[PDB]
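Hi,

I'm pasting everything inline rather than attaching a file, because the server keeps stripping attachments. The sequence lines come first, and each chain or strand is labelled.
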Amino acid sequence: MDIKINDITLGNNSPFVLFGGINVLESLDSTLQTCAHYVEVTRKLGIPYIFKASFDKAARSSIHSYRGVGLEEGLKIFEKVKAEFGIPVITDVHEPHQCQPVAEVCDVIQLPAFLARQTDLVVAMAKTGNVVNIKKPQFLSPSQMKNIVEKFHEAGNGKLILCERGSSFGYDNLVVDMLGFGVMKQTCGNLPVIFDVTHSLQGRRAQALDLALAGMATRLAGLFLESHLLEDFLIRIKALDDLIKSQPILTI
Amino acid sequence: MDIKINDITLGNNSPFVLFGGINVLESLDSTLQTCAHYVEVTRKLGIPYIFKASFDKAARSSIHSYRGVGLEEGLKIFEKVKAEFGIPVITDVHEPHQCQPVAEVCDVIQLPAFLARQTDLVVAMAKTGNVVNIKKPQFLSPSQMKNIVEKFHEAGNGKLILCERGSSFGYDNLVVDMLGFGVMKQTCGNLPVIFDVTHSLQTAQALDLALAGMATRLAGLFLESHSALPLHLLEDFLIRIKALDDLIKSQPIL
Amino acid sequence: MDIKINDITLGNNSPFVLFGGINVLESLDSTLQTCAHYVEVTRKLGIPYIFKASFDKAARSSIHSYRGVGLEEGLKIFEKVKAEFGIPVITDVHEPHQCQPVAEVCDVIQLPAFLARQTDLVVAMAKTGNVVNIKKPQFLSPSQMKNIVEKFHEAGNGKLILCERGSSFGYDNLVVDMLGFGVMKQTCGNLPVIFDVTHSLRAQALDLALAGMATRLAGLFLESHALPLHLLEDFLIRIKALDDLIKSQPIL
Amino acid sequence: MDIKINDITLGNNSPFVLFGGINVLESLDSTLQTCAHYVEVTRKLGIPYIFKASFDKAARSSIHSYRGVGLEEGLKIFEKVKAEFGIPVITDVHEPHQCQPVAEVCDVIQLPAFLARQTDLVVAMAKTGNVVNIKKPQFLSPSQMKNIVEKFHEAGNGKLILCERGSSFGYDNLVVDMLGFGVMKQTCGNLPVIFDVTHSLQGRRAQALDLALAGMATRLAGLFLESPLHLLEDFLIRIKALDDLIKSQPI
Ligand SMILES: [Cl-]
Ligand SMILES: [Cl-]
Ligand SMILES: [Cl-]
Ligand SMILES: [Cl-]
Ligand SMILES: [Cl-]
Ligand SMILES: [Cl-]
Ligand SMILES: [Cl-]
Ligand SMILES: [Cl-]
Ligand code: NA
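And the predicted assembly:
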């Protein structure tokens, strides 16, 4: 199943889409600066790109860490990003009441992994009718994603993306099960699957490259960063993605 | 560090406290009946007791699934339970706005395992001044529990209970690391540690697992009856737990 | 099912048996001194006791670290222990050819966890007719112990002990699943189950040992030097207390 | 570090080598039959090839279940495979005494995962001077492979291949950590690393392909698999395409 996001086609048989940006929105000026670099690099390689940032982060490293500029200024910033660069945007929501106003502006709404089972948030997100990025909890099995998808379906929204982030492996460590992408595709109606390589990883650029390449080898709709260094990285991902997507899936 | 809950002393070197009850509040009469059995059984056994139930099941598998009586009905039932039996109660909270109203009624307020990183919920809970039960997420190591505790301390609340409920072990399975209890005591300033045997079993062995955990010298046991233990077996179950706890607590700390 | 080992009754409903001693047999005089201390303490507390050591460490830190005194000298040392103290002894074997000579001297012969699936060693051990201690591999689930047991049963030996040593938990780490004891009892005909706390890993050793013994076990398996040898008495007083309590109550 | 196995160059920046064949040797004819197909497919695709088989299944579930032809007959079959096809071969050894005789015939000798810490077997294998395939145990961290490599070096053999076969993931399940490949390369002096996709698993054809592709994306010396037929062709075409791309990019 493909998802149209403005002029972008997001799907597991389509050229991969890059999701990336900044952690939290501070100001228009800071935002445009970072977004501009992503846009320049991706445009240079012809890679579809969706800008990501949080406007109000509930899961913070410390209590008093800045949550972001908040809903009102945040959405004004996103509106400006969309107008200036002509790209779609993505943000996370954690309050059911925030889903509707966010969806007026943000093309994709993101369900944080820790809230992925919370019924009221899922329903509120579904009812926006927007594209939804479902972050996979690290303690959830790939075949358990079907139940989250079912809850969205119950609430009337099937425009869903599944976002791999790694799985709990003993204490602290995360491991990405390369077989889980296929299990999600098979059990969830071939919805677009994307790979959040950054979470999955907790030199370090070398690790990220190997892990990103391995994931994208399994034929995926997109790559998601919690992030010319970036250009060199994307050249390698694009090379592999173009190879993979240019071949038909195994014959039956 | 001990915590006083009304006349109960909760602590890792005190007699174990039963945090016992049901999955969800369903009606006043059913709640009062179940709670009366718990009170009757624990009183005769001499085990300090705190009644547990959720007012809402916020994360069921269908949006249409029954979620319980809800917050307003729920708090009315807790008020009646407290009035009738004179015991403390515990419930979980799911949204920051729920914390103060729930905390007005419920002695202990609980942070769901799925919501450990909901920093705004942590803050709202801490601000109530109530005793807090922190459910250790299945994805968090025992050494990392200190990070949640730190946040509550930064938010000005030190009346924290640490509750084991198992650790992720491959897909769709949990294991309880018996060493984790000691790690949490060591690294979180010897705050009360309790064991949720009921949610640790998520995938008959409840007694063996319960006894194993309590052998490591814990402030409390957390369990549900109706998976959960048949209510009529509670008395015989608790006889065994009490026998072992009394023994362990009688031995000098090594 | 109980197992008689000389005058000792080993079983999940009997007073726990201590399987204790040392890693590797390095000497004669030091072995006797260490054993003498285990004997004194266990006799003082009235705990059945079986002396343990390896004469040939097959899995060593380095190629050239001492494997131990070897078969012939090892068995001589075991004979001296038996003669001096009148206690049974346990040692491990690694090659089918070692099974007969070892079993003629040693009251229990042990199957190393790493070798527990090796058919030729299993058959050779079984055919001795000796009591056997089966170390559970860390990569093996409790419900699969019955398969090792059935291989022994096929080769004609039912005098089997099941020994817990923890399960792989992410990388370079072990966790002991307290539920595994019950699984083994239920699926393997209530054969004696014992707990190797040493190789499952210190108030740690104490917490872990007590937790395990709380589940009603035939024995506890440990090494000293590993616990400090002089703290043995305090340790066993605590274990005996819990075991005496648990074993004095009928199963529920 | 590359390893020469006859005219084959095995290394992490060389074209991937297929280590392919069957679970166990049953008979000469079927062995030659299966080997012929791998040779035919690999030759026409241009992929270096080493034929794999066990002479003994030392750890089956019943004492009576079938274990293969055994060492004496086993080695006879390998001798004939090398004669007919002129390819190198690989087999696993289970006892120290088997090492020198097996090594006389078999180009690569393999240290089973379960036995990888058996110090006498490590020494015996090292003493043959043969190329050695070290199967990483499912319980062992990738950073711990250097300890096994260190032993072979102290025993005087550095012709070592490191072979991924999955890591224990709860009970009765395996996961392959794609970051382990890089850790092994960085900590073990860039010795050839290969990927046993077959034993890492445990329709399923898509699964094996996806997993093989993911592993080979990390830039590996080889792929270790067992066999259908039509699927072998279909499988290797895709693996080669990916490997050719990856190996053409600068590190
Ligand atoms: Cl998560
Ligand atoms: Cl994100
Ligand atoms: Cl609960
Ligand atoms: Cl959890
Ligand atoms: Cl041992
Ligand atoms: Cl093991
Ligand atoms: Cl193999
Ligand atoms: Cl293994
Ligand atoms: Na004997």
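Chain D touches chain A at residues 167, 169, 175-179, 181-182, 205-207, 209-211, 213-219, 234, 238, 241-242, 245-246, 249 (CB under 8 Å).

If the labels don't parse on your end, tell me and I'll reformat.
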